[PDB]
């Protein structure tokens, strides 16, 4: 809401102004990886018991 200064003279009379707006968020999903393969895949889980 912007303010204003009351001003004397042949100046145009000042009217309060109000600024209404909206943004939007961004996304940018972040990725990390992994790898496990074969032998150590079935080493972990029942299969070695």
């Amino acid at each position: 809401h912007q303010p204003l200064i009351a001003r004397d003279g042949p100046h145009p009379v000042e009217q309060p102004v109000h600024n209404y707006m909206t943004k939007v968020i961004d996304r940018r999903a972040l990725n990390a990886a992994f790898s496990l393969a074969t032998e150590a895949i079935a080493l972990l889980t029942g299969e070695a018991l």
Binding site: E39, A42, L43, A48
Partner: protein, 49 residues
């Protein structure tokens, strides 16, 4: 519309099961389990004389 008697003596013997021990042929090998040889990725038996 028939009838089935079953012989008491003289059973049929379907699928005799041979065990690998009790053969004549197993003298030649000594067997051990290396239940990690699925994932062994190369093995060597080293006996030193």
């Amino acid at each position: 519309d028939v009838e089935f008697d079953a012989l008491l003596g003289s059973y049929c013997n379907t699928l005799s099961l041979v065990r690998f021990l009790e053969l004549g042929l197993s003298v030649a090998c000594v067997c051990t389990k290396f239940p990690e040889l699925a994932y062994m990725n190369e093995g060597r038996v080293q006996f030193e004389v």
